[PDB]
């Protein structure tokens with residue numbers, strides 16, 4: 001559990017900070033979860049535009065949403081940093097260049113993953129491989145769970161040992177993906193971009209998200225080296241929710257309200 005976000009504490013550090021960093025998950029955080037439906041309201045867009053208008057602020061939207069979604073709904077706010085398709089497409093603040101991070105990355109790890117995946121596929125009836133530009137996935141929905149543990153172990157003693165890649169399990173599913181698709185990696189990278197000089201660090205960081213993928217960002221900020229009172233990791237959810245975050249807000253409405261308070265600092 002966490003205490004409710006201390007809004008006075010937040011506002012005070014915001015006003016004091018000369019550089020500020022915002023990292024926002026989209027779905028469930030800036031807007032409610034719904035069953036292409038979750039388009040951003042005018043209020044959300046206006047609030048983000050006003051926040052990004054301040055050159056002291058670096059404002060990032062970090063989403064698994066398709067690149068076209070973020071581009072169409074938020075691209076017109078030029079100061080926003082956009083991360084789409086789980087970290088696969090990035091648009092820096094004030095850049096009109098979308099970058100494809102897969103084509104920048106050495107994907108040489110895929111061959112060895114395919115080798116390990118073929119080994120287990122030959123020994124696990126009904127299993128099969130799915131190949132993407134970025135992620136390689138071993139499906140066993142059709143013993144699976146045990147084989148997946150064996151496979152996970154083999155990937156760890158080989159592929160993961162020499163490639164910046166991480167192993168992710170699904171319900172009946174083993175996926176292997178570059179570290180750059182991990183939100184914690186993305187958050188760590190955003191902070192590291194300010195350099196190692198402590199006087200050039202952001203003095204205010206607000207990091208918001210609503211589910212397990214966002215827990216990685218909160219964990220990453222614990223390793224940032226930033227002064228405790230400078231970082232606000234906030235989960236969107238119940239007060240009783242176990243989280244790596246330090247604070248909670250109950251609903252996306254409370255998120256937008258909180259940003260609105262800052263906009264009026």
Ligand SMILES: [Mg+2]
Nearest residue numbers: 025027028210
């Ligand atoms: Mg979310």
